[PDB]
UniProtKB/Swiss-Prot annotation, chains A, B:
Organ and tissue specificity: Expressed by the venom gland.
Name listed for the protein in its UniProt record: Tau-theraphotoxin-Hs1a
2 X approximate repeats with cysteine pattern C-C-CC-C-C as annotated region, ranges: 2-71
Family: Belongs to the neurotoxin 23 family. Double-knot toxin subfamily.
Domain of life: Eukaryota
Single GO MF annotation: toxin activity
Curated annotation (Swiss-Prot), chain D:
Family: Belongs to the transient receptor (TC 1.A.4) family. TrpV subfamily. TRPV1 sub-subfamily.
Effect of residue 125 to Q: Minor modification of pore attributes
Topology feature Cytoplasmic, residues: 54-68
Part of the intact protein present: 504 to 685 of 838
Residues holding resiniferatoxin: 8-9, 47, 54
Record-given protein name: Transient receptor potential cation channel subfamily V member 1
Segments passing through the bilayer: 8-28, 33-53, 69-96, 132-159
Primary gene name: Trpv1
Quaternary structure note: Homotetramer. Interacts with PIRT. May also form a heteromeric channel with TRPV3. Interacts with CALM, PRKCM and CSK. Interacts with PRKCG and NTRK1, probably by forming a trimeric complex. Interacts with the Scolopendra mutilans RhTx toxin. Interacts with the spider Tau-theraphotoxin-Hs1a. Interacts with TMEM100. Interacts with PACS2.
Membrane side Extracellular: residue ranges: 29-32, 124-131
UniProtKB/Swiss-Prot annotation, chain E:
Subunit structure: Homotetramer. Interacts with PIRT. May also form a heteromeric channel with TRPV3. Interacts with CALM, PRKCM and CSK. Interacts with PRKCG and NTRK1, probably by forming a trimeric complex. Interacts with the Scolopendra mutilans RhTx toxin. Interacts with the spider Tau-theraphotoxin-Hs1a. Interacts with TMEM100. Interacts with PACS2.
Gene: Trpv1
Signal peptide: none
Residue span relative to the full protein: 504 to 582 of 838
Extracellular side: 29-32
Biological role: Non-selective calcium permeant cation channel involved in detection of noxious chemical and thermal stimuli. Seems to mediate proton influx and may be involved in intracellular acidosis in nociceptive neurons. Involved in mediation of inflammatory pain and hyperalgesia. Sensitized by a phosphatidylinositol second messenger system activated by receptor tyrosine kinases, which involves PKC isozymes and PCL. Activation by vanilloids, like capsaicin, and temperatures higher than 42 degrees Celsius.
Remarks, miscellaneous: Responses evoked by capsaicin, but not by low pH and heat, can be antagonized by capsazepine.
Protein's UniProt name: Transient receptor potential cation channel subfamily V member 1
Binding site for resiniferatoxin: 8-9, 47, 54
Native species: Rattus norvegicus
Amino acid sequence: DCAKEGEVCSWGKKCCDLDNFYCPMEFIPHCKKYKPYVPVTTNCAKEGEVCGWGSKCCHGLDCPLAFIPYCEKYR
Amino acid sequence: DCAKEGEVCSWGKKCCDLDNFYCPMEFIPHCKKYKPYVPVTTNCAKEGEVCGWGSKCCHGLDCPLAFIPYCEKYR
Amino acid sequence: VYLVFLFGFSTAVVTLIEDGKYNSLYSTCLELFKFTIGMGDLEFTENYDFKAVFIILLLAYVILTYILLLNMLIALMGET
Amino acid sequence: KSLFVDSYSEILFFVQSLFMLVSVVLYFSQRKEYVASMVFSLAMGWTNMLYYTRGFQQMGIYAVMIEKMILRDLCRFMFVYLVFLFGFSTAVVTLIEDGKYNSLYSTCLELFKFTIGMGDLEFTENYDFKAVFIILLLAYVILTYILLLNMLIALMGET
Amino acid sequence: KSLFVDSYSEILFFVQSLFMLVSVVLYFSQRKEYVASMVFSLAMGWTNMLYYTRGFQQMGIYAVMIEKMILRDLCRFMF
Ligand SMILES: CCCCCCCCCCCCC(=O)O[C@@H](COC(=O)CCC)COP(=O)(O)O[C@H]1[C@H](O)[C@@H](O)[C@@H](O)[C@@H](O)[C@@H]1O
Ligand SMILES: CCCCCCCCCCCCC(=O)O[C@@H](COC(=O)CCC)COP(=O)(O)O[C@H]1[C@H](O)[C@@H](O)[C@@H](O)[C@@H](O)[C@@H]1O
Ligand SMILES: CCCCCCCCCCC(=O)O[C@H](COC(=O)CCCCC)COP(=O)(O)OCCN
Ligand SMILES: CCCCCCCCCCC(=O)O[C@H](COC(=O)CCCCC)COP(=O)(O)OCCN
Ligand SMILES: CCCCCCCCCCC(=O)O[C@H](COC(=O)CCCCC)COP(=O)(O)OCCN
Ligand SMILES: CCCCCCCCCCC(=O)O[C@H](COC(=O)CCCCC)COP(=O)(O)OCCN
């Protein structure tokens, strides 16, 4: 049968229902429940600010690939 | 402007709308129209018959990866 | 020598994982051959039963074939 | 010291036998882990076919050359390679605590993939310290892939 | 002359120390950038383990060969 949360997985035994639980990659992994998607909020960088060097950007922007990238609206 | 069907593409000029366009990979390509799609008609192989060696299965079936494969009702 | 190593690790992998692209010797032999020419598929997105034993076999195979034997072939051609 | 330096084939055949016996013990103890033992016997059992390459001169000399490549060249390579891998792995895990890089094991695998030519220099994810990550990965790739891995081929040629 | 032609290991240990001090300065100034200075000092540190390969003959000669490979061959190829 399947392994429940908190039990050792992948040594000949899968986790239970995979919409709710997963087996991580850690060489003796234990089944863990998923976690929700918390949205990004303050402490992010805003539009026109230096992204990448220690501060990500909020939802409505993209941080380009450049040496000193600035977040911008992507259309 | 864009190039119409039959004109030479990719030498500094894209063709017009994607619904009737594909610039082939031919080193002097011409804009061509997407043909309609027909499913696998007759002359296919049937389930339990040999596939791969000059005959392909019909759309309800699939040909596995083996030296002498046979059409199977996949899933 | 290469075919001896290939068939050995192929049989082991097929025995370990009976399903999901490794349900035959032909498929598993091809998938392990792809590692030799540098286009392997080390994704590990699948939920196999004996993962973390699978990984040890693949790492051992890769070290034996890719790093050791191929560079040895280059050395021997240079000697010839 | 004699076993540590000589009679390797006896050790390998013995270890194959040990894996088989442990597999039988786990079989009759009503465990599923016996398969994990069994395959380690099987994968060894084919490689020990090379023992029989003696008795044919060309293949025998080839096998002896394999033996000296393993002991003299590969053993020195792997020590330095593991030191560099572990160093950059710890740095990357410290920098980026989330998503393929939240453990030493996952990060070690993802860095190991670069050496065998199936890396992942994508940088599509939204990390806090992107653009430092790129510098670390470029340094790692230059040090391992270009310098050390070709140096191994040169040393094998000399040997 | 000897600051670049010779005595590499003294320079590399010194540069590791400089990265550590810059990390401390950034730490107490309320800047997250102190992480960036930290990890470089970590990544250099595990590389400076090769300094101790002397005292073992085979690894010592191997490390000297690595030094010469960097300074002779790689520095033209990269150009
Ligand atoms: C998951 C599993 C994968 C692991 C597979 C690992 C590779 C197996 C490769 C197949 C090896 C079989 C074999 O052919 O055995 C090899 C030993 O394996 C190795 O090379 C290193 C193993 C590390 C030769 O051993 P040999 O008995 O010939 O030793 C010699 C004496 O006989 C002789 O009298 C002289 O004293 C001479 O100096 C001695 O050396
Ligand atoms: C995140 C970014 C990491 C960058 C890391 C870059 C690789 C470091 C590799 C490990 C370096 C440790 C080491 O051990 O450094 C090596 C050399 O460094 C290099 O490989 C190139 C550095 C540039 C030995 O330095 P050494 O002090 O012994 O110099 C020798 C004198 O002792 C002796 O008297 C002789 O006169 C001799 O001619 C001198 O050379
Ligand atoms: C030859 C080619 C090698 C390439 C692969 C290298 C993988 C080594 C993993 C290093 C490691 O550091 O592995 C950690 C320690 O365990 C071991 O793995 C012991 C066996 C390792 C024996 C050296 C993983 O443990 P963890 O619980 O997942 O730590 C995560 C904390 N949250
Ligand atoms: C060893 C292997 C090397 C592979 C990676 C090479 C990347 C080099 C980029 C070259 C460059 O020329 O980089 C441009 C100039 O700036 C710098 O980056 C200076 C610092 C660079 C120090 C040399 C990028 O600037 P940008 O603003 O993003 O240009 C976009 C304009 N809209
Ligand atoms: C160094 C790495 C090489 C890899 C790429 C090789 C490309 C050559 C293709 C050969 C060919 O067969 O190319 C034919 C002619 O094109 C040319 O190529 C001309 C130049 C040939 C002179 C060398 C194909 O004819 P087509 O009109 O382009 O396509 C219609 C077909 N029904
Ligand atoms: C040089 C590089 C080689 C890389 C590719 C090697 C692929 C060969 C696979 C070997 C094998 O062992 O192939 C099996 C036996 O058949 C043959 O293929 C005979 C011809 C083989 C001649 C020796 C596959 O048969 P199957 O029916 O699909 O078995 C699955 C049962 N469900």
